[PDB]
């Protein structure tokens, strides 16, 4: 258990969306070519209630995967330490969910 | 078990789960001590504070899908920024300078 406001206002990288909560109400508005670019309107309005999100989360790396599996680039910039994680999940075409993962990304990624 | 969801269990070397530590490619985080000490290394527990949650990673990242030679490549570029005043800040920097070369 975790308070819902402490859940959406805690350390940005550790934040999570509570049931009945908008994506923008936690990670800002959906953009394009920039961070926070994932998701259309339905998804942003429905949050985890949108079933496409549950599918996509199967593709998100876990904590260790993210840490030891991605290309990590840490660089001290004047505004602070920047820790960039570059993780790439690969879904082979034969994967039973392939089509749907594509359908989702297509409509969500801007 | 989907690769992106694996975890490091006790007595396993990081590289026995996520492969040998490289320089500028994927799987470049971790010095010998970390690779060998696995999840036991306390520095690991520190760093994990900076790794994004499932949600932060989906909605806070710069996501780039791309069909490639071997299937769909869903890329996540997430950047945790740690402010100088962060209680652990310095700690984070030390570990980072240790576990990364390039």
What DSSP assignment string belongs to chain B? --GGG----TT--GGGTS-S--SSSSS----HHHHHHGGG-HHHHHHTTTSPPHHHHHHSSEEEEEEETTEEEEEEEEEEEE-TT-TTHHHHHHHHHHH---
User: Could you tell me which chain A residue has the CA closest to the CA of B48?
Assistant: A63
CA dist B81 and B64 (Å) reads 21
Cα distance between residue B30 and residue B33, in whole Å: 8
Q: How far does the CA of residue A103 sit from the closest CA of chain B (Å)?
A: 11
A89-A104-B76-A55 Cα dihedral, nearest 10 degrees: -60
Q: What is the dihedral of CA B14, B19, B23, B25, to 10 degrees?
A: -120
Q: In b/e form, how buried is each residue of B4-33, taking b as 16+ CB within 10 angstroms?
A: bbbebeeeebbbebbeebeeeebbbbbbee
| Nearest chain B Cα distance for residue A107, angstroms | 11
Distance CA B55, CA B42 (A): 25
The resolution in angstroms reads 2.6
CB-side neighbour CA atoms (13 Å) of B94: 7
Phi, psi of B80 (to 5 degrees): -85, 125
Deposited experimental method: X-ray
* Residue A101 with chain B: CB contacts under 8 Å: 72, 74
Q: Which of B2, B4, B27 to mutate to test the interface with A (most CBs of A within 10 A)?
A: B4
Place of tokens 């394009």: A32
- Say which residues have a Cβ less than 8 Å from residue B102's Cβ, sequence separation at least 6: A73, B23, B24, B28
Q: Output phi, psi for B64, to 5 deg.
A: -130, 105
Question: How far, in Å, CA of A98 to CA of A100, rounded?
Answer: 6
Distance (Å, rounded) from C-alpha B69 to C-alpha B79? 27
Residue linked to tokens 């570029």: B77
- Contacts of residue A5, defined as CB under 8 A and 6 or more positions apart, other chains included, come to none
Question: 3-state DSSP call for residue A86?
Answer: strand
Cα separation, B36 vs B67, in Å, equals 35
Question: Hey, of A11, A19, A49, A60, which one would you mutate to test binding to chain B, going by the most B CBs within 10 A of its CB?
Answer: A60
Does the CA dihedral B77-B57-B51-A76 come out positive or negative?
A: positive
The beta strand positions in A6-79, using DSSP E, are 71-77
- The maximal CA–CA distance of chain B, rounded, in angstroms, is 45
């Amino acid at each position: 258990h975790m308070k819902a406001d402490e859940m959406a206002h805690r350390r940005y990288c550790k934040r999570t969306i509570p049931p009945n909560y908008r994506v923008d109400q936690v990670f800002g508005p959906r953009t394009k070519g920039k961070e926070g670019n994932f998701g259309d309107d339905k998804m942003n309005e429905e949050g985890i209630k949108d079933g496409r999100v549950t599918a996509m989360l199967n593709l998100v790396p876990s904590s260790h995967a993210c840490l030891f599996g991605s290309r990590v680039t840490p660089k001290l910039q004047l505004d602070g330490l920047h820790l960039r994680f570059e993780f790439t999940t690969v879904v082979p075409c034969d994967d039973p969910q392939f089509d749907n993962y594509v359908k989702i990304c297509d409509q969500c990624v801007d």
